[PDB]
Design an enzyme around this catalytic site. Structure first.
Site, PDB file in Angstrom:
ATOM      1  N   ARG A 105      -3.406 -14.607  -0.886  1.00 51.00           N
ATOM      2  CA  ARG A 105      -2.527 -14.464   0.258  1.00 51.00           C
ATOM      3  C   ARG A 105      -3.321 -14.896   1.468  1.00 51.00           C
ATOM      4  O   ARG A 105      -4.509 -14.610   1.569  1.00 51.00           O
ATOM      5  CB  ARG A 105      -2.043 -13.023   0.409  1.00 51.00           C
ATOM      6  CG  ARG A 105      -0.799 -12.924   1.308  1.00 51.00           C
ATOM      7  CD  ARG A 105      -0.043 -11.585   1.164  1.00 51.00           C
ATOM      8  NE  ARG A 105       1.394 -11.751   1.405  1.00 51.00           N
ATOM      9  CZ  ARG A 105       2.262 -10.752   1.534  1.00 51.00           C
ATOM     10  NH1 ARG A 105       1.853  -9.496   1.460  1.00 51.00           N
ATOM     11  NH2 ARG A 105       3.542 -11.009   1.735  1.00 51.00           N
ATOM     12  N   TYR A 165      -7.722  -9.055   7.608  1.00 54.08           N
ATOM     13  CA  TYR A 165      -8.770  -8.380   6.844  1.00 54.08           C
ATOM     14  C   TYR A 165      -9.987  -9.288   6.710  1.00 54.08           C
ATOM     15  O   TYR A 165     -10.064 -10.317   7.370  1.00 54.08           O
ATOM     16  CB  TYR A 165      -8.243  -7.869   5.499  1.00 54.08           C
ATOM     17  CG  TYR A 165      -7.124  -6.856   5.687  1.00 54.08           C
ATOM     18  CD1 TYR A 165      -7.304  -5.756   6.517  1.00 54.08           C
ATOM     19  CD2 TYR A 165      -5.891  -7.006   5.055  1.00 54.08           C
ATOM     20  CE1 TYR A 165      -6.297  -4.834   6.716  1.00 54.08           C
ATOM     21  CE2 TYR A 165      -4.866  -6.077   5.252  1.00 54.08           C
ATOM     22  CZ  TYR A 165      -5.080  -4.997   6.087  1.00 54.08           C
ATOM     23  OH  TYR A 165      -4.095  -4.061   6.303  1.00 54.08           O
ATOM     24  N   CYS A 203       0.818  -1.214   0.000  1.00 61.42           N
ATOM     25  CA  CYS A 203       0.000   0.000   0.000  1.00 61.42           C
ATOM     26  C   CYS A 203       0.852   1.264   0.000  1.00 61.42           C
ATOM     27  O   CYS A 203       1.888   1.322   0.655  1.00 61.42           O
ATOM     28  CB  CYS A 203      -0.923   0.037   1.214  1.00 61.42           C
ATOM     29  SG  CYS A 203      -2.323  -1.084   1.106  1.00 61.42           S
ATOM     30  N   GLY A 234       9.873  -6.842  -0.342  1.00 62.26           N
ATOM     31  CA  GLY A 234       8.998  -5.693  -0.229  1.00 62.26           C
ATOM     32  C   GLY A 234       9.753  -4.394   0.009  1.00 62.26           C
ATOM     33  O   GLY A 234      10.055  -3.646  -0.930  1.00 62.26           O
TER      34      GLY A 234
HETATM   35  C1  LIG Z   1       4.183   0.097   3.323  1.00 60.83           C
HETATM   36  C2  LIG Z   1       3.952  -1.389   3.332  1.00 60.83           C
HETATM   37  C3  LIG Z   1       2.744  -1.662   2.695  1.00 60.83           C
HETATM   38  C4  LIG Z   1       2.233  -2.950   2.532  1.00 60.83           C
HETATM   39  N1  LIG Z   1       1.026  -3.178   1.902  1.00 60.83           N
HETATM   40  C5  LIG Z   1       0.546  -4.465   1.743  1.00 60.83           C
HETATM   41  C6  LIG Z   1      -0.632  -4.836   1.116  1.00 60.83           C
HETATM   42  O1  LIG Z   1      -1.338  -3.939   0.639  1.00 60.83           O
HETATM   43  N2  LIG Z   1      -1.038  -6.148   1.012  1.00 60.83           N
HETATM   44  C7  LIG Z   1      -0.313  -7.211   1.511  1.00 60.83           C
HETATM   45  O2  LIG Z   1      -0.619  -8.399   1.447  1.00 60.83           O
HETATM   46  N3  LIG Z   1       0.867  -6.883   2.124  1.00 60.83           N
HETATM   47  C8  LIG Z   1       1.247  -5.571   2.219  1.00 60.83           C
HETATM   48  N4  LIG Z   1       2.444  -5.369   2.866  1.00 60.83           N
HETATM   49  C9  LIG Z   1       3.264  -6.527   3.389  1.00 60.83           C
HETATM   50  C10 LIG Z   1       4.374  -6.756   2.344  1.00 60.83           C
HETATM   51  O3  LIG Z   1       3.784  -7.281   1.172  1.00 60.83           O
HETATM   52  C11 LIG Z   1       5.480  -7.722   2.791  1.00 60.83           C
HETATM   53  O4  LIG Z   1       4.909  -8.979   3.110  1.00 60.83           O
HETATM   54  C12 LIG Z   1       6.242  -7.168   4.002  1.00 60.83           C
HETATM   55  O5  LIG Z   1       6.736  -5.856   3.771  1.00 60.83           O
HETATM   56  C13 LIG Z   1       7.420  -8.035   4.451  1.00 60.83           C
HETATM   57  O6  LIG Z   1       8.344  -8.259   3.401  1.00 60.83           O
HETATM   58  P1  LIG Z   1       9.722  -7.413   3.343  1.00 60.83           P
HETATM   59  O7  LIG Z   1      10.618  -7.791   4.501  1.00 60.83           O
HETATM   60  O8  LIG Z   1      10.438  -7.704   2.045  1.00 60.83           O
HETATM   61  O9  LIG Z   1       9.373  -5.950   3.509  1.00 60.83           O
HETATM   62  C14 LIG Z   1       2.909  -4.079   3.007  1.00 60.83           C
HETATM   63  C15 LIG Z   1       4.116  -3.785   3.637  1.00 60.83           C
HETATM   64  C16 LIG Z   1       4.629  -2.504   3.797  1.00 60.83           C
HETATM   65  C17 LIG Z   1       5.934  -2.159   4.475  1.00 60.83           C
END
Ligand SMILES: Cc1cc2nc3c(=O)[nH]c(=O)nc-3n(C[C@H](O)[C@H](O)[C@H](O)COP(=O)(O)O)c2cc1C
Ligand SMILES: Cc1cc2nc3c(=O)[nH]c(=O)nc-3n(C[C@H](O)[C@H](O)[C@H](O)COP(=O)(O)O)c2cc1C
Lengths: 359, 359
Positions: free
Chosen positions: B230, B182, B24, B324
């Site tokens: 997911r 959710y 997001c 991410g």
């Molecule tokens: C700003 C931010 C926004 C995210 N928005 C979503 C989302 O909309 N839907 C979802 O399933 N995960 C969302 N996530 C979770 C990420 O998809 C991801 O699983 C998480 O950041 C951990 O992975 P990473 O260590 O590579 O950051 C979001 C994470 C972050 C930091």
């Protein structure tokens, strides 16, 4: 941290001392920029840099380096820049543009498509123009056509028309491309200028094209926006002391003629040279120009190492640090630099959707 | 290198195993995406990743997490995505989208604006809906309204309408958001679902919303494009063995119902939990789902360390690696990873205007 102090020149304030120098993308068609450019430049602005200078943009069709160079030789070309300029400002960066004419180095292939002068019977090529009918040599063997006095008037006016469009498209910073062996650089250098008229021979004559272009541009470019140029102050051609002296003298004239900052480079006017490449190798040269012409400067080459950019600033070799390739590798280099130098809340170098997540 | 082998699922081929998970941005207005999104996603695609999944996009106004969440609840919202989808494809990445309904976690502030449920008399808020009238607690204290059978029909149809628009806007990959506390996650969990009807109580009943939504979406989503979801398979709530068993059973049903890949996460259904955060801590869990449901999986959390992503793949814990935050820090992370893992001509992970310069 010095790299992250703001910088004010005329009415423009940069949020830090990081400048993204002009870097050609070779993705334009008939001079017209597109979504490559928009996303590229937009992405860069959001990365945190204080100033983003758009790539060498041709003031005339024949002044493009390649068939993929951007142009601003019509009001439609200029208007294409408008959304991009607005996206750069939205991101908090200052939009600049380098306007250019590639001279004898024009009509060449994209770097990944040979990087050389376009073949005679390739329909994409065109005749190049220059001070004198002498070729660069090496990979650029085409002999340019010697400019007439009317060619010189026309090109000067192209530059004025270019600056005018740049102003109206919303740019807050302009850079004249008098460097890297292109048209402007080629008028100054004795290697490439063998003219026997008012535009060749003496220092005053070789300077004339560059000084007149500046003055003519000054007439349309707002007094309150930085007017700058890029200029190769030496060649590493075994004539460096004398070339530097003359280049510095010209820089003094630029300043007297309204130039607010000078982007200091190497001439690249001819191929038979010996450049001492190294991390920040331009620092000492840039610093001498700054002192002796008493003019703010930026320079580049290897400042992607954040501590090197920081030292250059603290030593007052530079007023802004230009970081090129590191920004192509990582559009968020400014954030990388903030973290590396220990900036407080470094992630807020980026816009909120990134910053909040990264703190 | 395993991270850089291609991956084929149905008719879609990813150029490598790097997936950018939905993140997001909270920059949409009334569900409508804009140039923030366009440049953000365009920039990411050019960075080199094989698959880019667009952030949680609401199937209904009340299913947004925040007033800044994207939406696809009308044909106009969908059409806004079209240019972005086309820009992602142009860059050689596969465009995916996660469609979502935030359930009881809806109507909350942006993370940098409190990250909490919107105040009663703030005009931006709205009533939330959920399986049962029970609040998350902590920073999300609002008690959601208990859904009627008609609410459930309507939401299911919203998801169908969402997938249909997603298909027509050009997405090649869809992810149903049945995770992170959710709506969908909240139907499955006994913490949040206290329904005494066909949609609560037993495993078959708690599964029902999720399974029906999938089947209904399957009717409009092309057979030849990956259909994924997911799903939080555990909570770290002291009930992990039994929760995992049931989650894995459901994953088996997903597979039987046409799910091509499962993005494995944590439920985040309630706040009173003890998550063992660490680099790739989800690997072992993801691997168990993969084995026991015999279904391809991805997961995330700390895979921004390229060697960690590589090991996860070689050990067959994951089929794609989701990275991410590292992509928010550096849109060109895939290029960073290629260099780190020794990929041949790593700079050509990027498009030519960058690659040629960086080799
Ligand atoms: C700003 C931010 C926004 C995210 N928005 C979503 C989302 O909309 N839907 C979802 O399933 N995960 C969302 N996530 C979770 C990420 O998809 C991801 O699983 C998480 O950041 C951990 O992975 P990473 O260590 O590579 O950051 C979001 C994470 C972050 C930091
Ligand atoms: C692809 C590429 C394109 C460039 N295009 C231009 C240009 O249009 N005008 C100009 O003055 N310099 C141009 N330059 C030179 C850069 O502005 C900069 O001086 C150079 O890359 C060295 O700095 P760096 O070490 O940070 O990369 C270009 C450089 C590169 C690699």
């Amino acid at each position: 941290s010095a790299l992250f102090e703001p910088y004010t020149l005329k009415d423009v304030t940069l949020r830090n001392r990081i400048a993204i120098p002009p870097m050609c993308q070779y993705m334009a068609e008939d001079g017209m920029i597109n979504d490559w450019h928009h996303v590229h430049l937009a992405g860069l602005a959001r990365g945190g840099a204080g100033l983003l200078v758009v790539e060498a943009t041709a003031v005339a069709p024949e002044g493009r380096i390649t068939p993929g160079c951007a142009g601003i030789w019509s009001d439609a070309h200029a208007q294409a820049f408008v959304p991009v300029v607005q996206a750069i400002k939205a991101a908090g960066s200052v939009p600049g543009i380098q306007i250019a004419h590639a001279g004898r180095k024009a009509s060449a292939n994209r770097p990944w498509e040979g990087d050389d002068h376009i073949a005679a019977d390739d329909t994409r090529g065109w005749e190049t123009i220059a001070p004198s009918a002498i070729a660069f040599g090496a990979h650029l063997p085409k002999v340019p056509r010697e400019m007439t006095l009317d060619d010189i008037a026309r090109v000067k006016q192209d530059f004025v028309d270019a600056a005018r469009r740049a102003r109206d498209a919303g740019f807050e910073w302009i850079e004249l491309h008098f460097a890297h062996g292109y048209l402007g650089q080629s008028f100054f250098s004795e290697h490439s200028n063998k003219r026997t008229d008012a535009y060749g021979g003496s220092f005053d004559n070789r300077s004339r094209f560059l000084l007149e272009t500046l003055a003519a541009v000054r007439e349309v470019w707002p007094e309150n926006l930085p007017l700058t140029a890029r200029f190769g102050v030496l060649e590493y051609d075994g004539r460096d002391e004398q070339t530097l002296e003359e280049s510095i003298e010209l820089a003094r004239r630029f300043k007297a003629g309204g130039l607010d900052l000078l982007s200091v480079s190497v001439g690249f006017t001819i191929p038979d040279t010996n450049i001492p490449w190294g991390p920040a190798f331009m620092g000492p040269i840039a610093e001498r120009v700054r002192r002796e012409a008493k003019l703010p400067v930026t320079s580049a080459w290897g400042f992607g190492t954040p501590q090197l950019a920081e030292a250059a600033l603290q030593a007052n070799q530079l007023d802004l640090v230009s970081v090129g390739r590191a920004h192509l590798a990582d559009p968020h280099w400014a954030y990388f630099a903030a973290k590396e130098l220990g900036v407080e809340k470094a992630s807020w170098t980026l816009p909120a959707p990134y910053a909040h997540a990264l703190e």
